[PDB]
Scaffold this active site. Structure first.
Site, PDB file in Angstrom:
ATOM      1  N   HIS A   1       0.827  -1.212   0.000  1.00  0.00           N
ATOM      2  CA  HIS A   1       0.000   0.000   0.000  1.00  0.00           C
ATOM      3  C   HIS A   1       0.860   1.260   0.000  1.00  0.00           C
ATOM      4  CE1 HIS A   1      -3.132  -2.851   0.913  1.00  0.00           C
ATOM      5  NE2 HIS A   1      -2.635  -3.101   2.112  1.00  0.00           N
TER       6      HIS A   1
ATOM      7  N   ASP B   1       8.205   2.776   8.363  1.00  0.00           N
ATOM      8  CA  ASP B   1       7.341   1.635   8.710  1.00  0.00           C
ATOM      9  C   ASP B   1       7.440   1.107  10.144  1.00  0.00           C
TER      10      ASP B   1
ATOM     11  N   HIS C   1     -24.795  11.943  -3.602  1.00  0.00           N
ATOM     12  CA  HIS C   1     -25.124  13.121  -2.793  1.00  0.00           C
ATOM     13  C   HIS C   1     -25.571  12.763  -1.374  1.00  0.00           C
ATOM     14  CE1 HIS C   1     -29.630  13.035  -2.950  1.00  0.00           C
ATOM     15  NE2 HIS C   1     -29.361  12.221  -3.952  1.00  0.00           N
TER      16      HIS C   1
ATOM     17  N   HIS D   1     -13.323   1.707   4.987  1.00  0.00           N
ATOM     18  CA  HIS D   1     -12.533   1.297   3.825  1.00  0.00           C
ATOM     19  C   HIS D   1     -13.541   0.997   2.720  1.00  0.00           C
ATOM     20  CE1 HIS D   1      -9.061  -1.344   2.148  1.00  0.00           C
ATOM     21  NE2 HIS D   1      -9.994  -1.265   1.216  1.00  0.00           N
TER      22      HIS D   1
ATOM     23  N   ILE E   1     -14.989  -5.027  -2.846  1.00  0.00           N
ATOM     24  CA  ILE E   1     -14.865  -4.671  -4.270  1.00  0.00           C
ATOM     25  C   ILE E   1     -16.201  -4.791  -5.010  1.00  0.00           C
ATOM     26  CG2 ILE E   1     -13.759  -5.197  -6.482  1.00  0.00           C
ATOM     27  CD1 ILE E   1     -11.536  -6.567  -4.667  1.00  0.00           C
TER      28      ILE E   1
END
Lengths: 191, 191, 191
Positions: free
Chosen positions: A11, A31, A121, A130, A151
């Protein structure tokens, strides 16, 4: 915004690309969790937390903020945000390419809006949620804090999803949910 | 890249639009299979193969290449490709509008990435695969050679799909697949 | 196009954002149905009807047109429309951000193409149909007048959907439909 940015991070590279798109010149990966307090001796470049996990991201967010850093939003130039929408300023929100956020929607601290997600809206997207690639929230949808939308998932108009809930890959939420839950779609079947 | 392009081609007009978007001035359609060898007497403008079918596309690709032509990639200007992603150069890859390819992903020869498809970080998309409009591959997904991912389909993180497989329209792949197969979603039911 | 636009309208603010994107300077909301005839005494700025409902939109369209107004199309600058596609001129069509309309497709009067919808080559989208966010129509698809395609829905190649039909959220149409109907997908199930 500073010329350089620290990214607490696969990421990490993706967030680096978004930072570079915004015009950041250099990215510095940081990290390490232990000894984070010592990082406060470093120059105060903007910071971002590139962790997909909502609970870890919030923990790091709180730790980084306490060490005197500004946690910026990373917003790809191709993201379209209505002038009447509210995106919480300097709140570690990631907005990926081709995300569209329509009039009077609100995006809270620490949210991830991944590529090609759409927030119609008057939506409210709760802190550290997420929203995965291609996931779409119809008008007046309220997503709780710490939710995950899989997804290509979607949420029909005027619905609320309670804090801490999970909507699976490809799933379509069709009813209001006042209690936390896990809401599943249908998996591809081998034929 | 040349000022003109030959397109071996309804997909032909669409590829023509993408070529014109890239800045090609003129497109010349060359749809004949028999007597293709004679085309080698023509000026060597860039070539593209506008055939959605993976097996035919590969056959034509091999024949065109053997006749001394360069088979370029057609990549819409709105496609976003991470600088750390690898798109095989001059390999007859089509990348349609609003496609996003993230860090360290790899796109192999002859692939079609149709409109608004998303290839997340560290993916590998195998040669002559067809990723349909809106289809999305999560992080670290390996799609085999000659695969078809249907409209609005998706593949969850860290999964592999074996060569020569088909993922249906709207379908969500949820498990690793080491063997070729056909993976179906759920059709709309008349009520 | 005029410097100002009247919008008959939450959809109103969204259409206002699209109008401003096109370069309209000011938007004037005119939401009243009764006494609409008197509006004909106003300066003839361009008009748009920001109503998601297909039947109401058509009614207002007919009333506004009879009062001597031009009902323009509102087309976000990020919408990509093939030069060989046909979008009916001054016909109250809304085309939202990141919509893609491919070669030789036809979009009829009063259609809504919402954010990130895709209309592939040679499609026909019938008058006053509503194509929701993320909905995708494959090549050579014919959508009848007054149809609704739900969020993230899709229609497979070469299919026709009869007038006045509804395709649910997340649903995948797989067969030709010569008669009006309602075609449902699968809802997320609480686990």
């Amino acid at each position: 915004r500073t010329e350089k940015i620290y990214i607490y991070g696969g990421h990490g590279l993706v967030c680096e690309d978004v930072a570079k798109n915004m015009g950041y010149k250099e990215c510095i990966f940081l990290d390490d969790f232990k000894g984070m307090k010592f990082e406060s001796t470093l120059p105060k470049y903007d910071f971002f937390i590139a962790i997909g996990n909502n609970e870890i991201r919030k923990k790091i967010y709180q730790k980084i903020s306490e060490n005197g850093f500004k946690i910026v939003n990373l917003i790809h130039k191709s993201a379209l945000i209505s002038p009447s929408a509210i995106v919480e300023e300097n709140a570690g929100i990631l907005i990926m390419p081709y995300v569209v956020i329509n009039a009077k929607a609100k995006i809270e601290k620490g949210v991830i809006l991944n590529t090609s997600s759409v927030i119609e809206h008057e939506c409210v997207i709760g802190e550290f949620s997420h929203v995965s690639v291609g996931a779409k929230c119809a008008g007046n949808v309220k997503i709780g804090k710490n939710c995950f939308l899989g997804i290509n998932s979607c949420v029909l108009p005027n619905l609320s999803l309670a804090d801490d809930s999970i909507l699976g890959g490809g799933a379509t939420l069709v009813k209001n949910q006042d209690e936390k839950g896990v809401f599943v779609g249908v998996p591809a079947k081998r034929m």
